[PDB]
Design a protein around this nucleic acid. Structure first.
Lengths: 175, 138, 123, 36, 133
RNA sequence: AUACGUUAAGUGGAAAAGGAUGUGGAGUUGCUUAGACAACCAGGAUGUUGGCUUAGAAGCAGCCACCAUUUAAAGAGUGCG
């Protein structure tokens, strides 16, 4: 019935520092993160279990309390399993291939398209259709996924450019 | 569209509204009825605008009730005419209205349809209004 | 809550006179898959068989408190209880087993029910 | 569209205030609305 | 699986069957003899037939009874029912006559019992506005 | 300044019909540890589109008698089709 009261197990190996005030430096094989936390929140570490508690039932605190748990769960999973977001290109002549760390995109614009990933992020291209942006940061992987989407806004009339897998673009009837 | 067959005088004083309604505050002829929160003049055309809105949405159903028959003329001097030089002429008619009065009534209608017919009337009427039901202590 | 008592008292009346029964998982319970079982009930008998998926631990397990005290282990997750009135046992243990083997709903590897004081292994 | 009296049109519509301005959002683009 | 109302007495020309089952990979020449076989017992009637489609292009068919409530017009003795049922009780039928009708529909009906098969037909007789007596 | 609160927009320091999961109080009521709202995994009715119809349109041209059974459950129909 509530969000932040729920326990979060640590599969391991993920250590969690409790440095003030308040910075949480999660660490592990995949990477590290330091989410900002205002003092009113109270994070505690049970053995292999992160915990969160609400100072009061006030409506402002009710909103912030449910966010802090969801972020920490996003943090640990990126330090372990990691994250990725597919992108289904659709069309005829559309294609994509890397040139160094940079990701060239042969979008239908006459101008060549290029996007540079930020550090800690890589973009493999297993196929010309699919696109995969691996990364330990959900906020960043979803941001890069948006920036790539920005190159081509989807057309309701026809499947073209970037498209989430899977998602149903609204059908339109031309004439 | 409702006008008197005859009136004793062609014109009358505009008057001064104040206080609770003299009567008719309690709906009973109909299962439900609109009740004004304040008081303001209502032209005859405004009344016709409300009843037409209900007859379409109601479709088949019980007869619309109208507790209020207009009787007080509103004077309307012709445009650009200078002040004074006689009183103007009654362009139309306006019913006196008091707060808490039952402006309209409806009966024999299902509870869902009744909520809407009272609502559309509320927009045609400048006065703020509220949903009302019959009381039976009783 | 009076309606819930009808859910309880009636099914207990069957279990007091019940002979045999079998575990059935509710996952992927296609309506067509149910009809194939319901037609088999028409051969074995009529309305006397019961499908009732009232399988809450707070529900059917309380009915098991009087008799059949082996349902406590089978209680977690999806269940589809069956009850017999008359009908000498035979095909009822066998017919449902044949269905799950040909796709259509997981059998749960037959957790088993009352027959003696045992569980697994339909006969 | 922008009207002072934004209202839901269908069941899919949802009322959500944003930046001090109430906005109704729906799976159908036409039903999207904002007051003020 | 594509259901169709192939006539019992005839099965060969393209426009009723043809491509519609020919795109299913069905071998039309080999089954038309089968439609004329079992359905010969009820010639002159339009018999619906379910058609399952196996991956191996093997096929098995299941014939069905002529459509329900058409029989009700015969038992009533009237060619057509009221356009205003119950409000206009044009026709009446005995309960025993309904028993003769329900038995014919048994292979088509999914009804568990003959007593239940009665109740199924009773919902059809009311559609004609016919009284149940 | 003291004490109980309220307000977040600079309202305070500019109006209205109307609109809104803004927020603080009060009351009434449905369901609810013989199980609630969220879900995530299950299935969607059987004769049947059923009568009257429009070329045909079967959950749906629309007007309706809109029936009873299979039952853990489902209207001969909530909806996008």
């Amino acid at each position: 019935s509530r969000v932040g009261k729920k326990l979060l197990e640590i599969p391991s190996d993920v250590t969690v520092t409790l440095n003030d005030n308040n910075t949480v430096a999660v660490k592990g094989p995949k990477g590290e993160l330091t989410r900002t936390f205002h003092p009113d929140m109270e994070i505690k570490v049970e053995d292999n279990v992160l915990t969160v508690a609400r100072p009061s039932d006030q409506k402002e605190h009710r909103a912030l309390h449910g966010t802090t748990r969801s972020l920490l769960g996003n943090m640990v999973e990126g330090v372990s399993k990691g994250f990725e977001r597919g992108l289904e290109l659709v069309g005829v002549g559309y294609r994509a291939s890397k040139s160094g760390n940079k990701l060239v995109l042969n979008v239908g614009y006459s101008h060549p398209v290029e996007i540079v990933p930020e550090e800690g992020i890589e973009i493999e291209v297993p196929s010309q259709t699919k696109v995969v942006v691996k990364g330990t940061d959900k906020e960043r992987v979803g941001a890069i996924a948006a920036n790539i989407r920005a190159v081509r806004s989807p057309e309701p009339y026809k499947g073209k450019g970037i498209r989430y897998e899977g998602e149903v673009v609204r059908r339109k009837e031309g004439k | 569209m409702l006008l008197p067959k005859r009136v004793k005088y062609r014109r009358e004083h505009r008057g001064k509204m104040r206080g609770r309604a003299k009567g008719g505050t309690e709906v009973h002829f109909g299962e439900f009825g609109i009740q004004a929160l304040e008081a303001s003049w209502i032209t005859n055309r405004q009344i016709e605008a409300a009843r037409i809105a209900m007859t379409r949405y109601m479709k088949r159903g019980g007869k619309v009730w109208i507790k209020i028959f207009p009787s007080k003329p509103y004077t309307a001097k012709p445009l650009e005419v200078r002040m004074g030089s006689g009183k103007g002429a009654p362009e139309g008619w306006v019913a006196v209205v008091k707060p808490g009065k039952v402006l309209f009534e409806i009966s024999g209608v299902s509870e869902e349809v009744a909520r809407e017919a009272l609502r559309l009337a509320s927009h045609k009427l400048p006065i703020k209004t509220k949903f009302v039901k019959r009381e039976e202590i009783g | 809550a009076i309606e819930t008592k009808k859910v309880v008292v009636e099914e207990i009346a069957s279990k007091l006179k019940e002979s045999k029964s079998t575990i059935i998982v509710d996952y992927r319970g296609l309506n067509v898959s149910e009809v194939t079982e319901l037609r088999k009930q028409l051969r074995e008998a009529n309305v006397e068989f019961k499908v009732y998926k009232n399988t809450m631990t707070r529900r059917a397990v309380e009915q098991a408190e009087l008799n059949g005290l082996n349902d406590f282990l089978t209680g977690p997750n999806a269940i589809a209880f069956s009850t017999e009135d008359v009908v000498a046992p035979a095909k009822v243990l066998n017919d449902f087993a044949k269905n799950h083997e040909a796709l259509e709903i997981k059998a749960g590897v037959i957790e088993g029910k009352v027959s003696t004081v045992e569980e697994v292994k339909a006969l | 569209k922008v009207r002072p009296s934004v209202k839901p049109i269908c069941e899919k519509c949802k009322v959500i205030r944003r930046k001090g301005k109430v906005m109704v959002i729906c799976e159908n683009p036409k039903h999207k609305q904002k007051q003020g | 699986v594509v259901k169709l109302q192939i006539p019992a007495g005839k099965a060969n020309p393209a426009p009723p069957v043809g491509p519609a089952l020919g795109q299913a990979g069905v071998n039309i020449m080999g089954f038309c003899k089968e439609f004329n076989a079992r359905t010969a017992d009820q010639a002159g009637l339009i018999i619906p037939v379910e058609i399952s489609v196996y991956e191996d292009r093997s096929f098995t068919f299941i014939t069905k009874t002529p459509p329900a409530a058409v029989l009700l017009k015969k038992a009533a003795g009237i060619e057509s029912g009221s356009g205003e049922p119950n409000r206009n009780k044009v026709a009446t039928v005995k309960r025993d006559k309904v028993r003769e009708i329900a038995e014919t529909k048994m292979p088509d009906l999914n009804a568990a019992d003959v007593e239940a098969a009665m109740r199924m037909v009773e919902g059809t007789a009311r559609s004609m506005g016919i009284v149940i007596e």
